[PDB]
UniProtKB/Swiss-Prot annotation, chains A, B, C:
Disulfide bond residue pairs: 62-94
Domain THD: 5-142
Native source species: Homo sapiens (Human)
Subcellular location field: Secreted
Protein name per the record: Tumor necrosis factor, soluble form
Residue intervals on the Extracellular side: 1-142
Length: 142, 142, 142
């Protein structure tokens, strides 16, 4: 534990089905006001924050070529409750023989106290996580 | 609600042709000394800065296989008027059937007041600033 | 000037064989306590750190399809002197036309004084340091 608000949650291996964020420990972090509610991060005070997140996709051979992987970081203010696209990226893996497609999103944003941030993916069934650090989501107060 | 120099500009949808950075946007930034001139960021004081940027490429089927996507972050010091390769990455999509190839660049650098930073791409025809959060460029003073 | 611990080492072109981190100056960093020993970064004090790294892979035509590129950032505490995956990602280039697959890893972690951090890759044969800004590794104290 230390100064400024901070969070660094990680995927859930046993949650084989969806993308659930957990407060584990190597240093998976979550303190100084920041809390995890409804699988989302909640900022404490007003200020500039650094938001980042990565997800790894994995597949055993392509179906056809109509496959698209997406990762996004939306911001939900308390006034409204809509998921405005802060950081978004897309990937088209296609076109034994496995395939892997990682995605990283990073950026600095001005956040207001009470805000709710989240990181979602469209195809949580390719979501790879057969190892520590292959998918995470975090933020820090600057 | 702020203090250190900071910038987080984004692509321009209507600039269908080139990569133009904009700031007059809700969750976008550009303040505390940092200004956007000639489509480039300009640092205020001397110090360590975090520079990041992402771009998303999109295509509708490959031409052949001789296609290379590149994203770079160069530095230009006032006196020495010359681009310095700070962050660079390359991608080869190729080898009906669309393709999405994102690229993220991040790093911490010591900058001198008056410096001019920029983020460029070689094939602005493959640029895909479709939805929000897809293509951006920012920096922050640590 | 600045005063928190910081490091931003880069690949070694002439080290044609392995991934060697170098710190001369500039446009890379390594100061304020942080040192580079045994090709690894060593933290000075206890606190939250931002760790990032990127590597670029390059190839001249695929062998078959059984090729996997990996980049990882392991930790090593004073107590248990063994690695600890902090950030890991994988990529599969294959599904004489060349190819380019970059990988970026970023995250915030709580580090204890005396810790040793490193960034490794499984196939240092494609590790592409032909240009500047293509392969780097750094950290900063928040």
């Amino acid at each position: 534990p230390s100064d400024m608000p901070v969070a660094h949650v990680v995927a859930n291996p046993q949650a084989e089905g969806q993308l659930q964020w957990l407060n584990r420990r190597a240093n998976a972090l979550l303190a100084n006001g920041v809390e995890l509610r409804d699988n989302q991060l909640v900022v404490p005070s007003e200020g500039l924050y650094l938001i980042y997140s990565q997800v790894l996709f994995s597949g055993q051979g392509c179906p056809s070529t109509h496959v698209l992987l997406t990762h996004t970081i939306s911001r939900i203010t308390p006034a409204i409750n809509r998921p405005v696209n802060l950081l978004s990226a897309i990937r088209s893996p296609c076109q034994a023989n496995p395939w892997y497609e990682p995605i990283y999103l990073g950026g600095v944003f001005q956040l207001e106290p009470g805000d709710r941030l989240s990181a979602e993916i469209n195809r949580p069934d390719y979501l790879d996580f057969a190892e520590s650090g292959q998918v995470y989501f975090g933020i820090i107060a600057l």
